[PDB]
Design a protein around this ligand. Structure first.
Ligand SMILES: CC[C@H]1OC(=O)[C@H](C)[C@@H](O[C@H]2C[C@@](C)(OC)[C@@H](O)[C@H](C)O2)[C@H](C)[C@@H](O[C@@H]2O[C@H](C)C[C@H](N(C)C)[C@H]2O)[C@](C)(O)C[C@@H](C)C(=O)[C@H](C)[C@@H](O)[C@]1(C)O
Ligand code: HEM
Length: 446
């Protein structure tokens, strides 16, 4: 079983009997991918405990798994139990049930329905520059994740649950959300055979107290009246449960919160270490919005450079680090055989820094994304939101949301690196991609 990749002739780091290669994860997922890439080349295999994982690297082979053979063979992500009623959530859902849930949720993510939402999101822009200005008054350097955390939290909770929070007020609905996001898992990887053993017991990774509260909180709101567009949905190929509704709303918190605020801390870090880029971006804002005008959907999508800054940050810091897809059946793909059961992984972080596709990959250069160079960028090497039918269904919201907050904060302030800033940046050698040390900067009002 640990002889699968050898048998098939695929190089890979050698596994220990039960742990597979999980002890190599001590250096973080990113450096693990980078080293394997540089060492084993185009394709490599390893083991998360017992699970064969096959990393792939060819834009062609990637297109086949992420777009072409999506519905037929590479439909699902790694299973993860035990999840109870959350198996109804779109990111957890598998096969035809996922197909159905995805179809029912598209209409909720169109640009337009999103344009109809920028106002809701704009409220929280003010709230963010205020908290930011308050910390700037003090005269001391700012830990940005306090405010970007709060901002990301507020935008995501608002849009998914109705409630309109200024968290400031940090003991109503906020406290359940905090308790939901941050929760054994080491063990689950060694023994996926222990997952069925736990689901029988009704043991679930999402805490029942909170889910209940959240389940109630939507029943109340559904009565006293993304949430709306899902209500819209329940009136009219397929149906859509009340329990499935709340499940998508919880999932939106999980997907939108930490990714968004992480990206903002990174984006801010780079503008601060690259003053001529911050300068040019503020120059752009001041041209499209003459004197601190309210940001608009139609306005944002007219901002060339900003889109290049956001994209180049995601190139160097793709929060999900990898894309995964389970292989349903024996497949021959662009002249390579993949057996059923294997997890095919796309190493986004590593591919984003491959000297074959990017010149000087370590350096931050928004130019890569300029009108000139952009059309040679491979859409299967650059994947901060994944690709195909099972890509990030909230990609467009997230970009709009980040940009909104970027806009408001940037026209009002300016960012120098101070004393306690990390130079150069260290990355969280742990979970989802994050600065290893909270980003701290000097925030002067302009
Ligand atoms: C951004 C895009 C998405 O990210 C991912 O899928 C990556 C690739 C996973 O890493 C996968 C894949 C892999 C290989 O890492 C890349 C693996 O090592 C881990 C265990 O799971 C994450 C984070 C998972 O792990 C869990 O996230 C919790 C917040 C912390 C928890 N743990 C650390 C306490 C961990 O189990 C998990 C289950 O998918 C989170 C659930 C809630 C989701 O469905 C959410 C909404 C996601 O779809 C997502 C955030 O949008
Ligand atoms: C920087 C911000 C964000 C990033 C980088 C991001 C990234 C991702 C990535 C990489 C995936 C996996 C794609 C793949 O596997 O091919 C994904 C899936 C998903 N994302 Fe996001 N996301 C962000 C914000 C959001 C927001 C704000 C929402 C909700 C509005 C959201 C909702 C979802 C959902 C529901 C899925 C699973 C889709 C499916 O399984 O069909 N994301 N996201």
């Amino acid at each position: 079983s640990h002889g699968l990749f050898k048998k098939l002739g695929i190089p890979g780091p050698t596994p220990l009997p039960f742990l597979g290669n999980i002890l190599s994860y001590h250096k973080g997922f990113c450096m693990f991918d980078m080293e394997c890439h540089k060492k084993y080349g185009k394709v490599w295999g390893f083991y998360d405990g017992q699970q064969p994982v096959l990393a792939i690297t060819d834009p062609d082979m990637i297109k086949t798994v992420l777009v072409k053979e999506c519905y037929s063979v590479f439909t699902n992500r790694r299973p993860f139990g035990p999840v109870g009623f959350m198996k109804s959530a779109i990111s957890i859902a598998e096969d035809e049930e996922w197909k159905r849930l995805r179809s029912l949720l598209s209409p909720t993510f169109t640009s337009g329905k999103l344009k109809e939402m920028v106002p809701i999101i704009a409220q929280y822009g003010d709230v963010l520059v205020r908290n930011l200005r308050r910390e700037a008054e003090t005269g001391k350097p700012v830990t940005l994740k306090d405010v970007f955390g709060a901002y990301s939290m507020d935008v995501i909770t608002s849009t998914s649950f109705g409630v309109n929070i200024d968290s400031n007020p940090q003991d109503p609905f906020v406290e359940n959300t905090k308790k939901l996001l941050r929760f054994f898992f080491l063990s689950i990887t060694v023994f996926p055979f222990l997952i069925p053993i736990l689901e029988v017991l009704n043991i679930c990774v999402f805490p029942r107290e909170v889910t209940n509260f959240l389940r109630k909180s939507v029943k109340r709101m559904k009565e006293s009246r993304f949430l709306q567009l899902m209500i819209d949905s329940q009136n009219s190929h397929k149906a859509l449960s009340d329990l499935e509704l709340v499940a998508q709303s919880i999932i939106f918190i999980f997907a939108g919160y930490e990714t968004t605020s992480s990206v903002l801390s990174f984006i801010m870090y780079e503008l601060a270490t690259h003053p001529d880029v911050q300068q040019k971006l503020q120059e752009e804002i001041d041209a499209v919005l003459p004197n601190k005008a309210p940001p608009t959907y139609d306005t944002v999508l007219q901002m060339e450079y900003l889109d290049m800054v956001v994209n180049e940050t995601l190139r160097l810091f793709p929060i999900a680090m990898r894309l995964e897809r389970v292989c349903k059946k024996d497949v021959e793909i662009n002249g390579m055989f993949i057996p059923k059961g294997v997890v095919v992984m796309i190493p986004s972080y590593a591919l984003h820094r491959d000297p074959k596709y990017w010149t000087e990959p370590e350096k931050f250069l928004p130019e890569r994304f300029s009108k000139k160079n952009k059309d040679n960028i491979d859409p299967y090497i650059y994947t901060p939101f994944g690709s195909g039918p099972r890509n990030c269904i909230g990609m467009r919201f997230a970009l709009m949301n980040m940009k909104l907050a970027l806009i408001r904060v940037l026209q009002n302030f300016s960012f120098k690196p101070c004393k306690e800033t990390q130079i150069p940046l260290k990355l969280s050698l742990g979970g989802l991609l994050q600065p290893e040390k909270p980003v701290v900067l000097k925030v002067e009002s302009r």
